[PDB]
Amino acid sequence: HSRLLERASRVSAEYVEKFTNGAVTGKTGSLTALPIIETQAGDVSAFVPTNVISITDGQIFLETSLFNAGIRPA
Amino acid sequence: VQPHVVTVLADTAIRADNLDEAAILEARKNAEQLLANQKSDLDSAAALAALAETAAQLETIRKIKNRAQ
């Protein structure tokens, strides 16, 4: 998972200028990722979710009890 | 008053002497008010606080009852 998620980044104008040999001088690139994981009964202590939480820059927890109660998104 | 018995029915009677007995009625007032204050200090602190904490998070335990992981 690490060598997959670590590719999503933002590169400086120098890198993009070097990559295109001077065609795109001004700007800067980027790439955003939104990996999706599913947990069993809210057990975020499992193996794969623990690995993935460590790598990403955040998370957005969606709850079932909040979903039924009408709060959508949860 | 009766030939052998005198009965005095008083709205508020205190056994002390002078006219300034508000200065001694205030002691009973303050003591009873302090007791009534500390009571409500114990009703919330002991009963209503703990008895909601116990019932707070039971559902998180009952759902994982059958899991073998």
Q: Does the bond joining B3 to the residue before it have cis omega, within 30 degrees of 0?
A: no
Measure in Å the smallest separation between the Cα of A58 and chain B Cα atoms. Answer: 24
The backbone torsions φ and ψ at residue A5, rounded to the nearest 5 degrees and listed phi first, read: -75, -25
What residues of A are in the B interface, CB distance below 8 Å? 40-43, 46, 65
The SS3 of residue A7 is coil
Any A CB within 8 A of B65 CB: no
H or E stretch at B5: none
Tracing tokens 């670590």 back to the chain, one arrives at: A6
**B20 φ/ψ sector (left φ>0, alpha ψ -120 to 50, else beta):** alpha
Kindly compute the dihedral angle of the four CA atoms of residues B25, B26, B30, B33, in this order, to the nearest 10 degrees: 60
Task: Measure Cα distances from A71 to A37, A41, A58, B7, B58 in Å.
Answer: 21, 19, 21, 72, 22
Supply the DSSP symbol for B49: H
Tokens matching residue A34 = 């939104």
User: Which of B57, B62, B66, B69 is the mutation pick for testing A, counting most A CBs within 10 A?
Assistant: B69
Closest by CA to B64, choosing from A64, A36, A44, A42, is: A42
Task: Measure Cα distances from A34 to A31, A42, B57 in Å.
Answer: 10, 19, 31
Measure in Å the smallest separation between the Cα of B44 and chain A Cα atoms. Answer: 29
Cβ neighbors of A6 (< 8 A, separation 6 or more) are A55
Measure in Å the smallest separation between the Cα of A70 and chain B Cα atoms. Answer: 19
Any A CB within 8 A of B58 CB: no
| Chain A residues with beta carbon closer than 8 angstroms to that of B65 | none
Resolution at which this structure was determined, Å: 3.1
In A, minimum Cα distance to B61 occurs at: A41
